[PDB]
C-alpha cells in the first residue's frame, strides 16, 4: 500500500502556468549527465551535428519546481533534451521508492516534431541477469503527450504505428488509462553504441500538458507483467523527444519528488 504525499512543498500542477525567464542556455549536445548548478538533477543534450540547431534552456534550481527547461528546434534528427534524477549507481528501482513528477508545460503545435515524438518521463535501465541479451539494456518511457504528426492528431494518443513493438497490456494511472508497450530496437543508437535493446512504453490514452506521473507504479506495472527493468537503473528524466520539425517545449513547472510508501517526502525541491 502507498500513500501519496500530501507535503506543502508540492506545486499544483494544474495552477503553474506562469511563464519563466532568465534560465541557463544549452547549444550542444552535453556528453552524457551533466550536473546543474544548486541542483540535484541532470541534464542531457542529444544535439546530433547532421541535425540543425537545437537547445535546452535550463530555469534553475530557484524556480518552476528545480527541473523546468524550455527547449528548441529547428530540423533536428532525432533531438532529445531531458533533465532530472541521474543514478546510474547499481540499484534497482525500488531502492529509489516512490516516485513523482508534477509538470505544466506549453508547446508548438501539431507536426511540429517529425513523423515521431515523445513528451514524458524517461531513461534506462540495465539488467545484467537478463534472460535474453536483448533484455540487458532498457530504455523506457512514460508518454505523456506527443506533437502529432501528418496521419494522427496530438490530442489522440499515439501507438504501435509510431513506436513498432507489440501491445503488452494497459492499465489506469494518475487519471487516465495507459497502453503498454514492448519494442525491439535492433541495432540501433543506445547509452552502449550502436546495438540491439528493448523499449517499454506506457502512452497516455488521453495526453496532457499538466499533471502528476506516479512513476513507480509504472515501473511495478511493467514488472507484472514480465517486463524486469533489472539492478541498475542509469536514470529518470524529463525529455522532449522530436523526430525532426521546428518547435518548441517551454515547461513552466517540473518537479521531481520522492516519498517512502507512508507519503513522507524522502527528496524533493526546492
Known amino acids: 500500500q502507498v ?18 525567464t532568465g534560465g541557463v542556455t544549452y547549444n550542444t549536445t552535453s556528453g552524457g549527465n551533466k550536473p546543474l548548478a544548486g541542483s540535484p ?16 534552456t535550463w530555469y534553475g534550481a530557484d524556480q518552476g519546481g528545480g527541473a523546468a527547461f524550455k ?9 532529445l533534451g531531458r533533465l532530472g534524477y541521474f543514478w546510474n549507481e547499481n540499484k534497482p528501482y525500488s531502492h529509489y521508492e516512490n516516485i513523482y513528477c508534477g509538470f505544466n508545460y506549453t508547446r508548438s503545435g501539431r507536426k511540429t516534431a517529425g513523423d515521431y515524438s515523445y513528451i514524458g518521463i524517461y531513461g534506462w535501465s540495465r539488467n545484467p541477469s537478463a534472460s535474453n541479451s536483448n533484455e540487458r ?17 496530438d490530442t489522440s494518443p499515439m501507438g504501435i504505428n ?25 541495432n540501433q543508437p543506445s547509452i552502449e553504441g550502436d546495438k540491439t535493446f528493448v523499449q517499454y512504453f506506457s502512452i497516455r490514452q488521453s495526453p496532457r500538458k ?9 515501473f511495478k506495472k511493467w514488472e507484472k ?22 518547435g518548441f517545449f517551454d515547461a513552466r513547472l517540473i518537479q521531481f519528488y ?12 526546492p
Not at 538533477?41 to 537547445?55: K, L, M, N, Q, R
Not at 509510431?162 to 535492433?186: C, H, L, P
Open 3 to 20: 500513500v501519496k504525499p500530501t507535503d506543502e512543498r508540492i506545486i499544483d500542477p494544474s495552477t503553474a502556468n506562469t511563464q519563466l
Open 41 to 56: 538533477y541532470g541534464y542531457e543534450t542529444w544535439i546530433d551535428t547532421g541535425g540543425g540547431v537545437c537547445s535546452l
Open 71 to 79: 527547449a528548441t528546434w529547428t530540423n533536428p534528427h532525432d533531438f
Open 137 to 153: 539494456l532498457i530504455e523506457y518511457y512514460i508518454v505523456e503527450d506527443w506533437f502529432g504528426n501528418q496521419w494522427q492528431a
Open 162 to 186: 509510431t513506436t513498432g513493438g507489440t501491445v503488452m497490456g494497459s492499465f489506469t494511472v494518475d487519471g487516465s488509462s495507459y497502453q503498454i508497450i514492448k519494442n525491439t530496437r535492433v
Open 210 to 218: 499538466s499533471g502528476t506521473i506516479s512513476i513507480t507504479e509504472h
Open 225 to 246: 507483467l514480465g517486463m524486469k527493468l533489472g539492478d541498475n537503473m542509469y536514470e529518470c528524466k524529463f525529455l522532449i523527444e522530436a523526430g525532426a520539425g521546428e
Open 258 to 269: 520522492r516519498a517512502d510508501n507512508e507519503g513522507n517526502i524522502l527528496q524533493i525541491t
